């Protein structure tokens, strides 16, 4: 059986980890845990019974209950092939321009515009003497910002 | 803010297994830092999710990886 468990948004992978270690420690009949980025605020727990999942999450912080019913295997199959890997571009990230005349040119993200879905880029090529602005989708992450 | 992206695990390009290593401890192919989704297989022989994913070794896996 597979159940959907509500979680704090952005903490799905962390709760899945905690669930996994708890399940092993306490020898609960929990066979897998799925956290899909298509199901934000939700972690799917595969177990023998609902009681196993109730035991699993008992007193677990940042978890707010099991969704009524079950999740059939048909609903899970599509989650195994995710689509549209929409990267989170941040200030300080090093990126590479995907297409166009500057294909392959690398740049540091000096600024990010969420309202417009754009990023401003200090290019490594000194031939372009000014930061240029592109849509997020014309760029891929080469290296994440360091902090 | 202390995001610490370098401390996050990489994913095997062949089998999607999560690890900090440059190469996969399971199948020895290169890993990538470019992955999404999490499937934790605790019991592969009893998990039908793992059966559907083609996973027969227990561990944490990305749902997809590119590089
Ligand atoms: Fe830091
Ligand atoms: Fe970050
Ligand atoms: Zn591998």
Report d(CA A133, CA A110) in Å as an integer.
Answer: 10
Closest CA–CA distance from residue B25 to any residue of chain A (Å):
19
Find, in chain B, the residue whose alpha carbon is nearest to that of A48.
B46
Which of B6, B43, B52 lies closest to A31 in CB terms? B43
Q: Cβ–Cβ of B40/A16 closer than 8 Å?
A: yes
Residue B10 — φ and ψ, nearest 5°?
A: -95, 170
Domains contained in chain B, number: 1
Method: X-ray
Q: Cβ–Cβ of B39/A34 closer than 8 Å?
A: yes
Closest CA–CA distance from residue B15 to any residue of chain A (Å):
13
Q: Give me the resolution in angstroms, 1 decimal.
A: 2.3
Give the range of the structural domain holding residue B33, as residue numbers without chain letter.
1-67
Is A16 part of the contact surface with chain B (CB cutoff 8 Å)? yes
Residue with tokens 């699993």: A56
| Domains in chain A: boundaries | 1-85, 86-147
Q: Kindly give the distance from the C-alpha atom of residue B17 to the centroid of ligand 2, in angstroms, as a whole number.
A: 23
* CA A144 vs CA A59, A91, A114, A120: distances in Å: 35, 9, 18, 16
Q: Kindly give the distance from the C-alpha atom of residue A95 to the centroid of ligand 2, in angstroms, as a whole number.
A: 14
Q: Which CATH architecture has domain A1-85?
A: 2-Layer Sandwich (3.30)
Residue A76 Ramachandran class (φ > 0 left, ψ -120 to 50 alpha, else beta): alpha
Q: What is the dihedral of CA A28, A34, A35, A36, to 10 degrees?
A: -170
Q: Cβ–Cβ of A30/B42 closer than 8 Å?
A: yes
CATH of the domain at B58: 2.20.28.90
Q: Cβ–Cβ of A33/B39 closer than 8 Å?
A: yes
Residue with tokens 């022989």: B45
**Residues of chain A contacting residue B50, judged by C-beta atoms under 8 Å apart:** 31-32
Q: Is A25 within 8 Å of A17 (Cβ atoms)? A: no
Is A2 part of the contact surface with chain B (CB cutoff 8 Å)? yes
Q: What is the torsional sign of CA A18, A21, A24, A26?
A: negative
User: Would you give the DSSP letter of residue A99?
Assistant: S
Q: Just give the CATH number of A86-147.
A: 2.30.30.30
What 3-state DSSP class applies to A80?
Answer: helix
Count chain A–chain B contacts defined by CB atoms under 8 A.
Answer: 89
Report d(CA A127, CA B43) in Å as an integer.
Answer: 56
CB atoms within 10 A of CB A145: 16
Long-range own/partner contacts, residues A98-103 (CB < 8 A, 24 or more apart): A98/A137, A98/A138, A98/A139, A98/A140, A99/A138, A100/A138
Q: Cβ–Cβ of B49/A13 closer than 8 Å?
A: no
Query: What Rg value do the Cα atoms of chain B yield, rounded?
Result: 12
């Amino acid at each position: 059986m597979i159940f959907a468990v509500r979680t704090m948004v952005g903490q799905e992978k962390n709760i899945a980890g905690l669930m996994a270690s708890r399940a092993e420690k306490e020898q609960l009949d929990v066979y897998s845990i799925l956290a899909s980025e298509s199901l934000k605020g939700y972690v799917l727990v595969e177990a023998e019974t609902k009681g196993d999942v109730e035991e699993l999450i008992k007193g677990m912080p940042r978890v707010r209950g099991i969704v009524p019913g079950t999740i059939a295997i048909e609903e899970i199959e599509p989650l195994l092939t995710p689509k549209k890997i929409i990267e989170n571009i941040e200030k300080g990230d090093v990126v590479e321009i995907i297409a166009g005349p500057f294909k392959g040119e690398r740049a540091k993200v000096i600024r990010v515009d969420k309202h417009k879905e754009e990023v401003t880029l200090e290019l490594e090529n000194a031939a372009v003497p000014i930061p240029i602005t592109l849509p997020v989708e014309g760029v891929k992450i080469v290296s994440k910002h360091k902090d | 803010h202390h995001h610490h992206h370098s401390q996050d695990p990489r994913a095997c390009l062949k089998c999607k297994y999560l690890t900090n290593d440059e190469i996969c401890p399971i199948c020895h192919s290169p890993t990538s830092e470019n992955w999404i989704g999490l499937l934790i297989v605790i019991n592969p022989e009893k998990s039908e999710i793992a059966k559907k994913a083609g996973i027969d070794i227990k561990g944490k896996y990305a749902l997809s990886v590119k590089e």
